[PDB]
Amino acid sequence: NSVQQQLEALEKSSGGRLGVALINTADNSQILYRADERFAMCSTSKVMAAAAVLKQSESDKHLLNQRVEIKKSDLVNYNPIAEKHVNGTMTLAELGAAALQYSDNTAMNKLIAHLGGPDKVTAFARSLGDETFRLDRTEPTLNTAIPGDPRDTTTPLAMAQTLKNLTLGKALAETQRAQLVTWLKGNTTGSASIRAGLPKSWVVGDKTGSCDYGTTNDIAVIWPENHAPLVLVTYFTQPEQKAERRRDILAAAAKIVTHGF
C-alpha cells in the first residue's frame, strides 16, 4: 500500500475527516491528504499569536519583558499557568511560553488583546504570505469547530507552509525564530499525538489542539537524527459535537508519513 492508500484507509476506519500535510525540507517534496480543506484550528492557532508578538519584538527591545497584569476576571476555561499568577503579572514572553507549552487559554487571550484583537492575528498571518489562516474569536469560543464554519480555521498545507516559514524559514529574525523553536520543543501537551508515532529519539517541537466535534490537531517540526527536518500538520475532525478526541489517529498518521525517514 502506498502512503496515500494507507492514509485513506486510516480515515475510512476513523469515523472522521483526516487532514495531513507533510513537507520534507530535503527536497520540498510533500505528502498531502485533504491538505486544502479547512479545519478548525483549536489551540494550534496559539502559534500564530505568539509568533505575531515575536515579530513585534524584533523592533521593540523591551516588548518581551513587558509586564501584563493577570486578574481573576481574565481566567477562562483552562488556565494552568495563568491561574498561578492571579493578582500578579506575567511578561509577554511568559505568556507566549504558557500559551504554547501548556496551551493556557488565558495566556492566548492576553496575547490577542495585546495585538489588538483576532483580526490583527489574521493580518500577521497574511504578512507571512498565509492567505488561508483566519482567527475570528478569542478563547474559548474559537473552539466551537462547527462543520463548515469558516471561523478560526485554516488548511493543513497552509499551516504546514507557515509553520515551516516560522520555524525554519524567512518569517522571523534569528533570535525570535530560535525562541519560537525553543517554546515548541518544550511543549508538554503532545505526548500522545504526533510524537507518539515517531522514533522516540527524534527531536520534536509541536503545538496540539483539541476542541468540539472531536477535533484533534497537532502541528510539528521534526528533526531526524540523520536527515533534514520534516514539517507535519495532522488535523482531524468528526460529525458529532461531543465526539471524543482521537490523538491516536494523529499518531497513526505520523507513523505512516514519516516512514523511511
UniProtKB/Swiss-Prot annotation:
InterPro entries: Beta-lactam/transpept-like, Beta-lactam_cat, Beta-lactam_class-A, Beta-lactam_class-A_AS. GO terms for molecular function: beta-lactamase activity. It catalyses: a beta-lactam + H2O = a substituted beta-amino acid. Coiled coil: none annotated. It holds the Pfam family Beta-lactamase2. Its EC number is 3.5.2.6. Keywords: Antibiotic resistance, Hydrolase, Plasmid, Signal. The active site is at residue 43. GO terms for biological process: beta-lactam antibiotic catabolic process; response to antibiotic. Substrate binds at residues 207-209. The keyword Transport does not apply. Belongs to the class-A beta-lactamase family. The class A beta-lactamase family has a specific amino-acid numbering system, sometimes called Ambler or ABL numbering and often misspelt as Amber. A multiple sequence alignment was used to derive a consensus sequence and then the consensus was numbered taking into account insertions and deletions. This allows use of identical numbers, e.g. for active site residues, despite differences in protein length. UniProt always uses natural numbering of residues, hence there appear to be differences in numbering between this entry and some papers. Monomer. This is Beta-lactamase Toho-1. It comes from Escherichia coli. The lineage of its organism: Bacteria, Pseudomonadati, Pseudomonadota, Gammaproteobacteria, Enterobacterales.
